[PDB]
Design a protein around this ligand. Structure first.
Ligand SMILES: CC[C@@H]1C(=O)N(C)c2cnc(Nc3ccc(C(=O)NC4CCN(C)CC4)cc3OC)nc2N1C1CCCC1
Ligand SMILES: [Cl-]
Length: 110
């Protein structure tokens, strides 16, 4: 991994770590819409994303640069902001995890 992608990998490891789990857990794995009874989820969300998919993409060297990684993490949060009412607990969790992400992403070496 390039130096910028090492930083992205560090962020990802942090987002998956036990100290953020109280608000990160909804983002760990792909939404199982049928299991949750959300039969409109895949009509509304065209491009699902979650942290385990980001991790697999990192491991497989799919991301060619930090921008492509950031776009996927942000897509995950946007899906949450699109599907759920803005006062939902899951949205509050997203906002908190996105705060973790954006502040550390901004420290990217360059
Ligand atoms: C996809 C919509 C939105 C979102 O954006 N993401 C990312 C999401 C990701 N993961 C979840 N996951 C779970 C969400 C609720 C429950 C749950 O409450 N289960 C009960 C627990 C106690 N038991 C006696 C009966 C069942 C379990 C979940 O997975 C473990 N929910 C998400 N939500 C929420 C889904 C509907 C409201 C918002
Ligand atoms: Cl972006």
């Amino acid at each position: 991994l390039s130096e910028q992608l090492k930083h992205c990998n560090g962020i990802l490891k942090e987002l998956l770590s036990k100290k953020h789990a109280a608000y990160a857990w909804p983002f760990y794995k792909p939404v199982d819409a049928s299991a949750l009874g959300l039969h409109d989820y895949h009509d509304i969300i065209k491009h699902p994303m979650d942290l385990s998919t980001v991790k697999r993409k990192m491991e497989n060297r799919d991301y060619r640069d930090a921008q492509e990684f950031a776009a996927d993490v942000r897509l995950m949060f946007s899906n949450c902001y699109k599907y759920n009412p803005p006062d939902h607990d899951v949205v509050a969790m997203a906002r908190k995890l996105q705060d973790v992400f954006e502040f550390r992403y901004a420290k990217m070496p360059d």
